[PDB]
Design a protein around this ligand. Structure first.
Ligand SMILES: Nc1ncnc2c1ncn2[C@@H]1O[C@H](COP(=O)(O)OP(=O)(O)O)[C@@H](O)[C@H]1O
Ligand SMILES: Nc1ncnc2c1ncn2[C@@H]1O[C@H](COP(=O)(O)OP(=O)(O)O)[C@@H](O)[C@H]1O
Ligand SMILES: Nc1ncnc2c1ncn2[C@@H]1O[C@H](COP(=O)(O)OP(=O)(O)O)[C@@H](O)[C@H]1O
Ligand SMILES: [Mg+2]
Ligand SMILES: [Mg+2]
Ligand SMILES: [Mg+2]
Lengths: 98, 317, 399, 372, 168, 151, 185
């Protein structure tokens, strides 16, 4: 959007921002539709310095990297896929309890 | 801008720069113009020699109309055999240009004005025919109607420079009437062109501008003299704007300006349709701002502390 | 059938370079500024480019539609496009294909607005949007006959409003490694103007600062040694002749700015606190964040672009700094492990088309027959709506 | 359909309302004014153009331009603005849901009628529209069927003799002297006493002066001789500036321009000689009835004592064997509207409209061959 | 405007003011999350029946309510295709700046040209007894604007025609 | 790939409309016959210039259901005709002389009639809506918002 | 919300303060007075110039001189010193952090306003500034829209008649007689 956080305290500031605002999506297409047609997803956050910025699709796009690591340039599979592979690689007996 | 330019600005600027320069440089740029005309500029032989070519789909009809001679006595000995893929070519060498600056400027303007210079051959022919019939009718007034009819029949000239445009021109003992077969594709273009053409007709009517040539437009039907002319569809979607140029409208001191104006007409109309679209854009946003003002009710009064400038209050108190 | 030649648009922050595909040079390179008032109606009394520049005190107020690469006001942009097309370029929109360019990291909203303006106000046959860089990689290789394309390198596009460091590997652009510094020729121009300001020179116009850069500024190895050399050496004290409007022979005594200005690139702290990472270090971070296998290709070929990389000794200093940092890291690894290595070389490359590499790459790309298939056809826009080009593709993965 | 729109787009004033009503819902001056200053203030709702009553109220900082000149519209932009005002700001009814009735002076250029019809049909998309002449409307309002109508208004004065149910188009006399010319003459002749009026605001003030003070005498020479002993004829008026001005022989001099057009330097017959010539141009067998039915209509005919003087002159001109009677209802200011509404609220009139389906199949020339 | 749109306008007013009894409600399928329920339509037990108000075949007012969010889309008159293009472009500009409007959608539902969406928060902070006032005011002013802009089109066409033709 | 192909629709069957509102105990043939008997009485009452009594009689029973579409359409057409055949000046007395449930049915059906204007007359429906909202109040519209979808 | 400095450099006093304040919080005479004695005394850090209230208090041995003459600036260096004092020693706010709002009399020389904005931009590096007119601001403070505003300060007396919104530029009458001339008389 244009906001730049190159200082060192800005790292903790945006960490608190993600703590307070960001959320994990439950249905990708539904949230793309919401962010494409409706302005309800917009939140207003005031920095501890006192300045306010606008956050939109970033709210549901920030933690998406956990489930789609290719967003951050990671070849490794997502959280759910990696969990599924780990459980499936185990023996057939313990698969329920896994 | 209100009036479209009458020549190719790029050619004018390039020629001026290369004439005023001291160290020429090899160039090879093909440039397109309005109505599908394309210009090609290159320096194949010598760095000081520049070749300029003209492309036009209707050029053979111009040759039929007698445009080679007009080009010859317009451009002097500069004529050069046409290049491949182009219609008319000119080769200019900087070592022979006139020393005086005004001659160089007028030569650059003339070369840049090649479009109307090649397109004006039918207009010049019509003017000469009009003069001939004018003197013949002045010889005997009783001999007017039959020669007028035979000129409307035989001297009826036409040209297709666009596939949805046509100029039909013919002389008489006192006037040179011209018919434009206007038609706009790209639906919204035709949508705005309906209003544009309607308002353009009215204009002439107003007593404020009666000195202008008479306009005549009627869609879904062509005039009496051009229904039998090939190429004129039976009013499918084509309008027909007709200008009647009397003797006073092409006086020996006003022929070239009238020719250029009547040539640029359609391009002016198109560009001004686009300008009207922009005018909407700006007005529409300008007072949807007023709607936002109307909405800005329903917001209880709140106070922001400092928000000084490019920052956040710049102070702890 | 035989289509008309494609048209290569270019809307930079400071300069806009129109032209055609297949040409050997842009037809027009004029500033991206429009003159505007505040019996022709106020709808049409606008001038652009050099005409706007000359007609500045006659009753118009200039305004720059593009800043930092992103368009803020839309009336100015649309009027700029219509004036260009119907005045200088002289083309009918409905019978041509356009190749627009715009800097990366732009909001999808800006692309949507550009597409809808182009396909509604003008409604051209087709519109294609490319990233300012790419074209730079395309124009990098000179003797591009059939095979000698690098297709793998780094393009450091530094311009008037914003600079971009974009790596490319085997054609595809690695999004995760894209990083951008918000400092360019305009910020250092403001710095030069401030330096003229503090010395109380008789003339301090911004155009004077631009010309002072044009024939004065150069890059230096380090600032303290350059200051010492300037103190010792007295022939580095030039006096540029201004002739602003009526001040004949009002020479401007230039000074330390000649080496203090270009140093912002290799020391961005001077410009502002918004950025603090020097350009060679940022390029190193970009290359390191890239996949391991393409690092050799990224380091081997580095392509400069934009008009702000024409400083003398800019490439030499950048190459020296990058080579020093990579040697430091490699040697640290060596003494950590205890074995020699062949190392990696760095070749920062400058070519004959530095100023308008983006335009030249676009012109070379548009001539390919496959380019037509990639354009957004008007039928697609009228079917799928005005949001046909909103999915941002080069940087980041959608959804 | 419940009711039909009707608008009397006169040169000076515009009258609008619904058919069948006996009172103008909306009357405002036909004025469109633009500002002529800077506006260093902030906000204030800067409006680009003020039309109608707003322009009349804020004429202090505006320049006013009448769209209609001498009965012929010259500023179609301002005319469209005024029609939009009538449709939306004051009557506030959707044009697309109401047939409308318009009024146009006789002998106007056909361009005026065609352009007005085309604008109403396309730009406003009215269901149906009709164009009628002022004299027929005056006869409809007065309840008569025979009698020459004198319609003197702000823009043009015309006479249309009409026998029982039939009009003689060859005996129609149109004179281009009207209220605007009278106001201009009053401005010119108020200068001889010192007071000067230049700007359009001063023109409106002079129009109000003519409203409140001007009157028509009986014998011009005797009235001037009486005014020579200027004792009990002068009056006073209060400008908005607060200064009091005195009016004299020019109180009644400028109304005489109607009867003596040579005052404003035009070679034409007065409003009585033109009526006499118009009657004499008709058939002999109908003059004996047209003399007995002289109809006064329009705003200009509201001067005190104009009817008596006109009757005196017509009686002097005509032979004494046949009596002369002139009639002027007290509501003759809106006689054109009243006739228009009566015509529009007639069952036999329902099939004489021009529907959109009829218009688009014949072009804008249909109005010439149907309306008149 | 009014004096002309009494019954349709009052019906829209009454229906809207009755349908704005919103409430804070979380998501029944996702925890620690709240979404506008009218847009998702996953839990039908809290979605009130869709409601339509009309005056003529070309004017409709689809009123879809829910426990927290209300979506209200309307159709405005387009008698001739000139008004069609004008309405489309104007309403696109209107929805292009929905960030500063707080009760607008950037894209209307299909078969319409505008869709308001009043989530709970707007009623929570912004006093809502004039949101409906803005609604009706816009529903009449929009036709006013379309008429005025077509007049301006005619005027500019006349001006350019005169300017072109006078210079012979 | 695996992101699409939602499964939440089958593993947990969401509540469906019959779980919210009481089911219709009457059969399709019974309600169809009842409506086919009520309508001609309303038409005859319209013919004899007693539209108020016809509307009152037609208002006594109201059909509903997802399998009675056609008969519901005929009932709605008859109701629209009956209401449009009523003089406007007598509306307030009629409105004031009704029970809350009867007024609820009236407002529900006039509002459904407003939904199809390509075949109906919207002016009379809007006028009736204005008068009933003015007299009875907003609770009628509240009940409309909280009525069965099949109504 | 977006606080801005409001500096009204009147000919007799310099009233200053932030935007939105009920009353200005910085009022002091516009006087710069240098000492006019040898000053054999040593120590105490005797300054070379005193501005404002300090100058007024030490006026016993100071050569006070106003830097403005009938609204027109004539002592640009002294006025720069006064502006520096206002920004730093009295308001205690950095100039480059808030925009300023200046006033000048109507019909003033154009070079005065040009140099005013040139100094406030080149020197203090202020973000933005505006040059209003005293009569317009008086109309603002009076809570009206029309009327003719008679303004008579220390420097000059001027009337700017303003109708609804619009101000007539041809009816501005400026008279140089003012408070300083009254004091001289
Ligand atoms: N010779 C030069 N040396 C250094 N900087 C230059 C030189 N010429 C131009 N510049 C600056 O660098 C900018 C980059 O040029 P260009 O790429 O055309 O601009 P943009 O980034 O706006 O597209 C110019 O706008 C100008 O400010
Ligand atoms: N009582 C009156 N006395 C004198 N003049 C009047 C009086 N009433 C109206 N007028 C003049 O008549 C004009 C009214 O014109 P009007 O009859 O409305 O024109 P139209 O018939 O074209 O609508 C005004 O301009 C005014 O000057
Ligand atoms: N209460 C008062 N009585 C008499 N004169 C006063 C009073 N208050 C101020 N003045 C005069 O007004 C002048 C100050 O005017 P001021 O408001 O500073 O105008 P400006 O701000 O334009 O300089 C002083 O010279 C003083 O003589
Ligand atoms: Mg650039
Ligand atoms: Mg009249
Ligand atoms: Mg003062």
């Amino acid at each position: 959007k244009g906001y730049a956080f190159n200082r060192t305290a800005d790292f903790e500031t945006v960490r608190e921002m993600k703590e307070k605002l960001c959320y994990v999506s439950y249905d990708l297409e539904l949230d793309h539709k919401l962010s494409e047609e409706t302005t309800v997803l917009m939140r207003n956050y005031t920095l501890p310095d006192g300045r306010v910025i606008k956050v939109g699709s970033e709210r549901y796009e920030c933690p998406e990297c956990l489930f789609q690591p290719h967003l951050v340039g990671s070849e490794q599979p997502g959280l759910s896929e990696f969990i599924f592979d780990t459980i499936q690689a185990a023996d057939v007996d313990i698969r329920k309890y896994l | 801008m209100l009036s479209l330019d009458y020549n190719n600005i790029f050619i004018y600027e390039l020629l001026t720069e290369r004439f005023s320069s001291e160290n020429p440089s090899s160039i090879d740029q093909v440039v397109t113009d309005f109505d599908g005309v394309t210009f090609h500029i290159s320096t194949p032989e010598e760095k000081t020699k520049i070749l300029i070519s003209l492309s036009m789909k209707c050029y053979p009809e111009l040759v039929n109309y007698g445009t080679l001679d007009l080009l010859k006595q317009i451009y002097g000995a500069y004529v050069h055999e046409p290049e491949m893929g182009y219609n008319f070519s000119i080769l200019i060498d900087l070592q022979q240009l006139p020393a005086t600056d005004e001659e160089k400027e007028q030569l650059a303007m003339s070369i840049s004005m090649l479009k109307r210079n090649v397109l004006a051959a039918p207009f010049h022919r019509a003017f000469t025919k009009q003069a001939e019939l004018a003197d013949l009718a002045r010889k005997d007034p009783e001999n007017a109607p039959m020669l007028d009819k035979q000129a409307t029949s035989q001297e009826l000239m036409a040209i297709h420079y666009r596939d949805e445009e046509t100029i039909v021109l013919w002389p008489e003992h006192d006037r040179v009437t011209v018919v434009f077969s206007t038609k706009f594709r790209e639906e919204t273009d035709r949508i705005f062109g309906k209003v544009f053409l309607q308002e353009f007709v009215d204009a002439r009517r107003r007593p404020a501008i009666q000195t202008a040539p008479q306009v005549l437009f009627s869609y879904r039907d062509p005039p009496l003299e051009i229904r039998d002319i090939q190429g004129i569809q039976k009013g499918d979607d084509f309008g027909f704007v007709t200008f009647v140029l009397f003797e006073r409208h092409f006086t020996p001191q006003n022929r070239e300006d009238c020719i250029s104006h009547i040539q640029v007409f359609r391009n002016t109309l198109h560009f001004h349709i686009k300008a009207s679209k922009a005018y909407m854009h700006q007005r529409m946003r300008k007072r949807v701002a007023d709607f936002q003002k109307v909405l800005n009710r329903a917001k209880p009064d709140v106070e922001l502390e400092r928000k000084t400038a490019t920052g956040r209050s710049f102070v702890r108190a | 059938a035989s289509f008309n030649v494609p048209i290569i648009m270019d809307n930079g922050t400071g300069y806009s370079k129109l032209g055609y595909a297949g040409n050997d040079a842009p037809s027009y390179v004029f500033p991206t500024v429009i003159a505007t008032r505040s019996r022709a109606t106020e709808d049409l009394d606008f001038f652009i480019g050099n005409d706007a520049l000359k007609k500045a005190s006659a009753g118009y107020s200039l305004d720059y539609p593009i800043r930092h690469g992103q368009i803020e006001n839309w009336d100015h942009m649309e009027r700029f496009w219509q004036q260009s097309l119907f005045k200088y370029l002289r083309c009918e929109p409905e019978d041509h294909y356009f190749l627009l360019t715009e800097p990366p990291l732009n909001p999808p909203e800006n692309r949507e607005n550009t597409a809808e303006i182009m396909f509604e106000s003008f409604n051209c046959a087709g519109l294609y949007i490319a990233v300012q860089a790419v074209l730079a990689l395309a124009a990098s290789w000179t003797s591009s006959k059939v095979t000698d394309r690098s297709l793998t390198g780094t393009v450091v596009d530094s311009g008037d409003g914003v600079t971009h460091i974009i790596p490319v590997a085997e054609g595809y652009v690695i999004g995760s490694s894209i990083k951008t510094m918000p400092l360019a020729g305009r910020d250092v121009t403001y710095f030069v103007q401030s330096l003229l300001r503090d010395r109380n020179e008789p003339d301090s116009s911004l155009k004077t600062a631009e010309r002072i850069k044009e024939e004065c500024c150069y890059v230096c190895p380090d600032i303290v040694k350059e200051f010492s050399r300037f103190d010792r050496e007295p022939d580095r004290y030039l006096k540029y002749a201004s002739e602003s409007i009526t001040g004949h022979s009002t020479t401007i005594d230039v000074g330390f700015e000649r080496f203090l200005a270009p140093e912002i690139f290799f020391n961005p702290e001077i410009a502002s606190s918004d950025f603090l990472t020097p350009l060679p270090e940022l390029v190193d971070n970009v290359v390191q964040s890239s996949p391991i296998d393409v690092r050799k290709g990224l380091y081997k070929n580095i392509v400069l672009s934009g008009g702000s990389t024409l400083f003398k000794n800019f490439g030499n200093r950048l190459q020296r700094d990058l080579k020093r940092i990579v040697d430091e890291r490699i040697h640290r690894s060596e003494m950590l492990s205890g074995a020699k290595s062949g190392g990696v070389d760095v070749n920062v490359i400058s070519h004959k088309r530095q100023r308008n590499a983006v335009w030249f790459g676009g012109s070379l790309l548009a001539q390919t027959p496959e380019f037509g298939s990639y354009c957004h056809t008007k039928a697609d826009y009228e079917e799928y709506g005005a949001s046909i080009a909103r999915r941002y593709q080069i940087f980041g993965n959608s959804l | 359909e419940t009711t039909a729109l009707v608008c009397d787009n006169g040169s000076g004033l515009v009258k609008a309302g619904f058919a069948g009503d006996d009172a103008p819902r909306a009357v405002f001056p036909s004025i469109v004014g633009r500002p002529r200053h800077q506006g260093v203030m902030v906000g204030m709702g800067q409006k680009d153009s003020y039309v109608g009553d707003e322009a009349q109220s804020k004429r202090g900082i505006l320049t006013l331009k009448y769209p209609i000149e001498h009965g012929i519209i010259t500023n179609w932009d301002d005319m469209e603005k005024i029609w939009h005002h009538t449709f939306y700001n004051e009557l506030r009814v959707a044009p697309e849901e109401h047939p409308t009735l318009l009024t146009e002076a006789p002998l106007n250029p056909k361009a005026n009628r065609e352009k007005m019809t085309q604008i109403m049909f396309e730009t406003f998309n009215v269901p149906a529209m009709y164009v009628a002449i002022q004299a027929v409307l005056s006869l409809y309002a007065s309840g008569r069927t025979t009698g020459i109508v004198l319609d003197s208004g702000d823009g043009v004065t015309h006479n249309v003799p009409i026998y029982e149910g039939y009009a003689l188009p060859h005996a129609i006399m149109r004179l281009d002297l009207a209220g605007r010319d009278l106001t201009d003459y009053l401005m010119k002749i108020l200068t001889e006493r010192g007071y000067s009026f230049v700007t359009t605001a001063e023109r409106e003030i002079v129009r109000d002066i003519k409203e409140k003070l001007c009157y028509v005498a009986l014998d011009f020479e005797n009235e001037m001789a009486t005014a020579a002993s200027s004792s009990s004829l002068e009056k006073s008026y209060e400008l908005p500036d607060g200064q009091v001005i005195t009016i004299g022989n020019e109180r009644f001099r400028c109304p005489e321009t109607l009867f003596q057009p040579s005052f404003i330097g035009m070679e034409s017959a007065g409003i009585h000689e033109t009526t006499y010539n118009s009657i004499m141009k008709c058939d002999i067998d109908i003059r004996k009835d047209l003399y007995a039915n002289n109809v006064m209509s329009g705003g200009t005919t509201m001067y005190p004592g104009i009817a008596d003087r006109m009757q005196k002159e017509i009686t002097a001109l005509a032979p004494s064997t046949m009596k002369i009677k002139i009639i002027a209802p007290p509501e003759r200011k809106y006689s054109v509207w009243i006739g228009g509404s009566i015509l529009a609220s007639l069952s036999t009139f329902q099939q004489m409209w021009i529907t959109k389906q009829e218009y688009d199949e014949a072009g804008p020339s249909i109005v010439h061959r149907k309306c008149f | 405007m009014s004096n002309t749109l009494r019954p349709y306008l009052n019906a829209v007013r009454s229906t809207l003011t009755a349908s704005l009894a919103l409430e804070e409600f979380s998501s029944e399928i996702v925890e620690r999350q709240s979404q506008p329920e009218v847009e998702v339509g996953r839990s039908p037990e809290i979605l009130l029946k869709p409601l339509v108000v009309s005056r003529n075949e070309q004017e409709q007012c689809l009123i879809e309510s829910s426990v927290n969010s209300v979506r209200f889309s309307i159709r405005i008159k387009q008698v001739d295709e000139i008004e069609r293009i004008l309405v489309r472009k104007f309403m696109q500009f209107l929805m292009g700046r929905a960030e500063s409007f707080f009760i607008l959608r950037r894209k209307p539902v299909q078969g319409y040209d505008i869709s308001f969406l009043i989530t709970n928060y707007h009623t929570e902070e912004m006093l809502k007894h004039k949101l409906v006032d803005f609604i009706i005011e816009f529903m009449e002013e929009v036709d006013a604007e379309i008429s005025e802009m077509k007049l301006f089109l005619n005027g500019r066409a006349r001006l350019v025609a005169e300017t072109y033709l006078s210079c012979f | 790939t695996f992101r699409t192909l939602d499964v939440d629709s089958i593993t947990e069957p969401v509540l469906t409309e019959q779980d919210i509102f009481p089911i219709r105990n009457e059969t399709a043939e019974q309600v169809q016959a009842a409506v086919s008997q009520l309508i001609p009485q309303a038409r005859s009452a319209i013919q004899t210039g007693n539209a108020l009594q016809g509307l009152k009689t037609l208002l006594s029973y109201v059909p509903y259901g997802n399998d009675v579409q056609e008969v519901r359409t005929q009932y709605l057409n008859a109701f629209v005709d009956v209401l449009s055949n009523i003089r406007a000046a007598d509306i307030p007395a009629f409105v004031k002389e009704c029970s809350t449930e009867e007024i609820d049915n009236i407002v529900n059906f006039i509002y459904r009639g407003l939904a199809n204007p390509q075949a109906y007359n919207s002016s009379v429906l809007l006028n009736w809506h204005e008068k009933v909202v003015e007299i009875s109040g907003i609770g009628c519209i509240v009940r409309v918002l909280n009525s069965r979808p099949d109504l």
